[PDB]
């Protein structure tokens, strides 16, 4: 019985395991629940706290994946596999994880808190990229991790309703930040001094806890990889809320009350099989239960919220990869396979638009070709391909990402921005798609560090730096190394300058306007253009 | 006859001329000057297509420059020669139609390529006796036959009731073709080739170049065609039939008067009262406007220019067409607040969005912001210098070099052999100030080969510039290709196609081959645009 391994925290006592770190070896307290299990009657419900328990749980072992749809479009494929649950699906799943160095820090030590993605429909703390041991044993960080409720389970709303008020699963979030707050101490982590960071989904979750007041006592920090809560796919009105559920509900058989008391008679499954027929479109990037503006853990919408908001206290790390649109194409665009290169034609282009941006009109469709065919190369296939991914990312993070972080710099916060340029060795999409979305996050995390898994020498030591900047942001709020020169330092983003850095190979090179022009065309025109029916 | 210069007398269908031995760079040339072709359209006859000029008796003295027609002239800025060079330099009269020829000296004795130039001036303004179009130059070093024509402007030349028969429209036009007709009949007396004429023109000058390509009787009067930044597209060529009517029945009653009774007292106005209301008949505060411009009548023009170039089959067709650096500059201190030619026009964002009203006049709000929104620079949104050159921009944009580049792609993909330029150089000589840049018209003095001429200060290079320049337009004329037969060890010229959309930088240095006529920006004025003005 290591007593490094054995924490008491506020609901009782716990047992981690020794992992090893390839230098070294960390303590991790896997699977604490830190809410009841939302389970039967519960279902659709906000969390309660986890009641107090008797002797010693076992926290060695990852706890359940929270009830999902699971992709099997490309079975037996690793660039599906590594999004997949592993372990089992469960609406018993409200727990999280705790990697710590070993031994226990001597000192308060800053804690970064994990919030993956997964379109608020899928996802799991388990997966191999959210491994937090590399980061606690290089860096001596406190990493948490939380499951939170996913599709129907986590964010179904009939909005106005007691018993399905919906953002359950950012509530779920919340609760997990409340643990941490409670009990990270116990862990040698410093409950004040708490980054939140999160890719996709996760990012507009921790965007959403930046404009939701009761979530900002929580952490201090932020971090929103490839996602915001502004843009086309984050949240849902009310009224469109609504609308799903009593679809949804119509689809598996089913006055408020009524219906979501027949809601939970319902097993997982078909609420699963459903999930994916309530949306008022063929679209991608666009998901059937998001967190829904609500008048309460969201005031108002995102857009409202950060052109208003006071961010003075505040520092925030943003960026995207050179490539985030390219991954969705093959969900749905007709003329896209992972198999071949996907030369498309510009009749395809103009369809895939019409999908990508689903809400569009003719016009505005005609607006946004127009502006992302190349002239000199109307027709040319490997053009249009490339145009298609970029209309796609750009609209869905990398223009509502440009524009949270002028919104986040003109109103107080110190904001840094990058665009992560790096397509690692181990990929096993095709070549066109580039630089996908969620391929910085194993680098963040450190899984180079591990000799097994065959990263190049490059890639282990961009690791290493990337680490440093995470967790150099988690202890300062700034990126930069504390004590080094002739780097060149990373600057701080602003609404004049517009500067940011790649992450790549190559030492950071700064660049100003992420995407500037074309990003005025989606977040100053386009909205007027749509505001005409 | 008896005493005179045997090389100086010669005859045409209307009668005898003489002609004056005038004195270029490299030796004599013959010029024929203020030769009539059309009776005089006064009295009862204005408003009233051209007729050809009744026989004369006796030997008519064509050594001097006639009459320019009828038109305003620019007072903005006394003595400054960045605007008194394209001042009438001749008497104001309505009795303006004339033409001048020059010749090699002594005249060709076997058929020579014939250039006829068409000058510009917005449809309100020109003469074709400015030194700017001086004809001797391509005259001495080139062998051509040059012919320029005075044609009506303004309400004289483009005032229309169409429908009406006193004043049918286009008539300015219509002068331009008889002086054509003129060159087919009469131009071998001179040497010329009539089975060879080219026809080039600058700004409503090309406008006019393109309005007779697209015109069925003109098309049998030319071969070849340049067009100098302007084309018959675009926004500012050409008229509606119903604003035309507005625009004249406005004017008439500003001046105080069915069609026939108010083109009765319009023809007992005096001219100058017709030119002192003629700028304020325009539906908008405008720049690149004019009030009286060719009309779409369903007669010269059959339909508008952009269903004719759409559609057109032209199969026979060599053309080149080209643009300044800087088509906007100019026009920015006329009319946009903020901008002066005394000053660096460093402007303000809100300066810009007036500009962009006053420049785009026939914009919705949502078209403005559109315009406003591309021109942006949104690293840097607020910077004067920008601010200045986008304005510019977009006014040339809009109206010379995307309407160029429309022009250029419809006619390539129809059968044409396209040449495409975009003219570099900046006169040594230039009175504007630096920012503007290249202006609209400063290419002219470099085509007719102005900078030979020892007295006029150019630079060696401008020189021999200008004779490149002039081989250039005289191969074209000749031939229907700009390219030297022979000297092919200098850089070639390609034809312009919707595939690979070249065209050339004309400067100081070497031909430079480039790609797409801004090809980005002319798909938002071209493509994009027309659909948000039906929205």
Request: proline residues 8%; hydrophobic residues 40%; charged residues 20%.
């Amino acid at each position: 019985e290591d007593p490094q391994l054995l924490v008491r925290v506020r609901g009782g006592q716990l047992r981690g395991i020794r992992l090893k770190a390839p230098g070294g070896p960390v303590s991790a307290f896997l699977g604490i629940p830190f809410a009841e299990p939302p389970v039967g009657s519960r279902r659709f419900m906000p969390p309660e706290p986890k009641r107090p328990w008797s002797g010693v749980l076992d926290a060695t072992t990852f706890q359940n994946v929270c009830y999902q749809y699971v992709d099997t479009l490309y079975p037996g494929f690793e660039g599906t596999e590594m999004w997949n649950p592993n372990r089992e699906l469960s609406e018993d799943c409200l727990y999280l994880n705790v990697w710590t160095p070993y031994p226990r820090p001597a000192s308060p030590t800053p804690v970064l808190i994990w919030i993956y993605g997964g379109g608020f429909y899928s996802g799991a703390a388990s997966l191999d990229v959210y491994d937090g041991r590399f980061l606690a044993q290089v860096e001596g960080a406190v990493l948490v991790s939380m499951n939170y409720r996913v599709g129907t389970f986590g964010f179904l709303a009939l909005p106005g309703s007691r018993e399905a008020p919906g953002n359950v699963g950012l509530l779920d979030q919340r609760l997990a930040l409340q643990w941490v707050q409670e009990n990270i101490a116990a862990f040698g982590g410093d409950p004040m001094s708490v980054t939140l960071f999160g890719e996709s989904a996760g990012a507009a979750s921790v965007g959403m806890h930046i404009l939701s007041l009761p979530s900002r006592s929580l952490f201090h920090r932020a971090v929103l990889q490839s996602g915001t809560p502004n843009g086309p796919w984050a949240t849902v009105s009310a009224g469109e809320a609504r609308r799903r559920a009593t679809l949804l509900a119509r689809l598996v058989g089913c006055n408020d009350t009524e219906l979501i008391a027949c809601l939970r008679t319902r097993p997982a499954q078909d609420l699963v099989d459903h999930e994916w027929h309530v949306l008022p479109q063929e679209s991608i990037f666009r998901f059937s239960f998001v967190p829904v503006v609500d008048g309460d853990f969201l005031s108002d919408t995102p857009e409202a919220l950060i052109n208003t908001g006071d961010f003075q206290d505040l520092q925030v790390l943003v960026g995207v990869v050179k490539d985030e649109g390219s991954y969705f194409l093959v969900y749905g665009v007709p003329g896209f396979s992972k198999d071949n290169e996907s030369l498309i034609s510009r009749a395809q282009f103009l369809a895939g638009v019409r999908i990508g941006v689903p809400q569009a009109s003719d016009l505005a469709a005609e607006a946004v070709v127009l502006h992302y065919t190349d002239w000199l190369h109307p027709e040319d296939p490997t053009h249009l391909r490339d145009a298609m991914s970029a209309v796609v990312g750009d609209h869905n993070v990398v223009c509502p990402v440009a524009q949270l972080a002028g919104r986040l710099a003109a109103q107080g916060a110190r904001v840094y921005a990058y665009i992560f340029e790096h397509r690692a060795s181990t990929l096993t999409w095709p070549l066109w798609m580039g630089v996908p979305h969620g391929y910085e996050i194993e680098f963040i995390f450190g899984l180079p560090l591990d000799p097994s898994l065959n990263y190049t020498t490059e890639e282990r030591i961009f690791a290493q730096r990337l680490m440093k900047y995470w967790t150099n942001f988690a202890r300062t709020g700034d990126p930069n190394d504390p004590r080094d020169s002739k780097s060149p330092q990373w600057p701080p983003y602003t609404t004049a300058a517009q500067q940011y850095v790649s992450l790549n190979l190559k030492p950071l090179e700064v660049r100003r306007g992420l995407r500037a022009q074309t990003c005025a065309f989606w977040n100053r025109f386009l909205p007027k253009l749509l505001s005409a029916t």
